[PDB]
Amino acid sequence: SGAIYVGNYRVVNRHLATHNDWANLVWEDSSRDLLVSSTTAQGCDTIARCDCQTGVYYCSSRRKHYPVSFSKPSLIFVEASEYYPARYQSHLMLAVGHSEPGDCGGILRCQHGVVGIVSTGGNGLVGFADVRDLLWLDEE
């Protein structure tokens, strides 16, 4: 589990959104595994606006932050899970690193701010849902 709190927005994995998230919905995209809801209190995270391919991510199954090199946001094939059938996920970035069912939501960050959140994994890989193209998260 895990979320990004920027301004009056909460960014979570679509597959982990609560009833309260859906009842206060701003935007969602199944093909990116993203959902954004509105909040009463202001958040303290800042979103990166860059093309960094290195950063650090939080892994809850190891209680540790790991440095990683990661691919550019792309259309990648993802195996079936209890949450989605086997399909292509868009705006996804891969890196070599530990991931487990329960690690989705962990933040990926570079020198400029929050890059994205854990969304896929397995086989010694970890996948991140990119949020750097979502410019509207910086206002309203």
Ligand X SMILES: NC(=O)c1ccccc1CC(=O)N1CCC[C@H](C(N)=O)C1
Q: Which residues are catalytic?
A: 15, 33, 104
- What beta strand segments (E) does the chain contain? 4-13, 25-29, 34-44, 54-59, 64-69, 74-78, 87-96, 107-110, 113-122, 125-130
Which of 21, 34, 119, 130 is in the footprint of ligand X by CB under 6 A? 119
Kindly state whether residue 52 participates in binding Zn ion, applying the rule CB under 5 A: yes
Tokens of residue 60, six digits: 């809850």
Q: Would you give the binding string for ligand X spanning residues 87-116, x where CB under 6 A is met? A: --x---------xxx-xx------------
1 is a site residue for ligand X (CB under 6 A): no
- How would you label 55-69 residue by residue, b for 16+ Cβ within 10 Å and e otherwise? bebbbbeeeeebebe
Among Zn ion, ligand X, none, residue 108 binds (CB under 5-8 Å by kind): none
Q: Is 21 helix (H, G, I), strand (E, B) or coil?
A: helix
Q: Give min distance, CB of 41 to ligand X, in A.
A: 28
Q: Answer yes or no whether residue 15 interacts with ligand X by CB under 6 A.
A: yes
DSSP single-letter state for residue 73: S
User: Distance between CA atoms of 81 and 67, rounded to whole angstroms?
Assistant: 27
By the rule CB under 5 A, 110 interacts with Zn ion: yes
**59 marked as part of a ligand binding site:** no
* Residues of this chain that bind ligand X (CB under 6 A): 15, 33, 78, 81, 83-84, 89, 99-101, 103-104, 118-122
